[PDB]
Symmetry: C2
Subunit: 190 residues, 2 copies
Amino acid sequence: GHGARSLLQFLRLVGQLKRVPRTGWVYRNVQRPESVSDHMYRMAVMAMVIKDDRLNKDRCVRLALVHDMAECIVGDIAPADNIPKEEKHRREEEAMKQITQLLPEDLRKELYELWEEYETQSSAEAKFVKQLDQCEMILQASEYEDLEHKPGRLQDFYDSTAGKFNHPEIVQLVSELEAERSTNIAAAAS
Amino acid sequence: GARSLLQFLRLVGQLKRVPRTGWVYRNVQRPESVSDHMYRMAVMAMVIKDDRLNKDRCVRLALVHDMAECIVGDIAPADNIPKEEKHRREEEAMKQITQLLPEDLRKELYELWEEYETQSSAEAKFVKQLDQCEMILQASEYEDLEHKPGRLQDFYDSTAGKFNHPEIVQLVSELEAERSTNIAAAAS
Ligand SMILES: [Mg+2]
Ligand SMILES: [Mg+2]
Ligand SMILES: [Mg+2]
Ligand SMILES: [Mg+2]
């Protein structure tokens, strides 16, 4: 039963994503921060409910579910960790090779190529998912601010996404989030 | 449009903060969320092979099946909610949740949930087995982390005879054998 054993080892590695807290929240003292799998779950849902008939939605959902999968080995590397982008890529690529080698060859190839597609940021689906990633993050940031009753506290996350959104539907979402958020901050400040 | 979609996504976000109830009831420290549970199920639908199943449908079913819990919470058998009442409450919640979406998506998302609740399609029945399989996998993982093998036996007992898809059966059999070996090692 080497096949079943390998699959089980694969699913245990995947399960480690539940126990990897998202690093940016930890570094900002968020109580009970979300896991990497929480982050990917809402991104996948976003891909299902944001309309764009030019995009292959199935591909978008799968990219969302695979894009941070290397984190079960590498951990969630944050800008504050000061890891060179090429070193981060090397670590993540090596981790993805180790993870996918536990799968039958068709699925090994598929899962790896999906991760590669996201990393490459060429396809429209990959670029769309990158925007979902950033949108999900700033949405989560405002949710923590609200839960804490500390509006504006996580402003650094918003600043870091300046100019990064361009998809028509995502842009409407972010604008509505920012209008609500900025108005709340102004009211709290006065 | 956007304001209601944002409300929808915030509701979906509540799933990150709903701990899976069975683990809470068994004093598991730092239990997984409902969204953690669905995430791994979705990955399982991606990597467990059966070309007679619509895999895209399986993934989507996994992502929607417990979505009503963002409003009603994760109801457990311990909670003693009649099956009919649990369905009534979840149905009500899915209606409330999906009415935040444009007509086409509202219908699509609600019908996905309904397919799962109905358990008619082969995909729905497969995802139901993924649900139970993911659960007992997580139970073994908690036992391992605690170094208390056998402690969460009840979750295994509750799944007895609920598996029949050959790939899922093989995975469950391997899990069971690895676990029982650990339990035997702790016993002597
Ligand atoms: Mg990361
Ligand atoms: Mg991400
Ligand atoms: Mg439940
Ligand atoms: Mg479930």
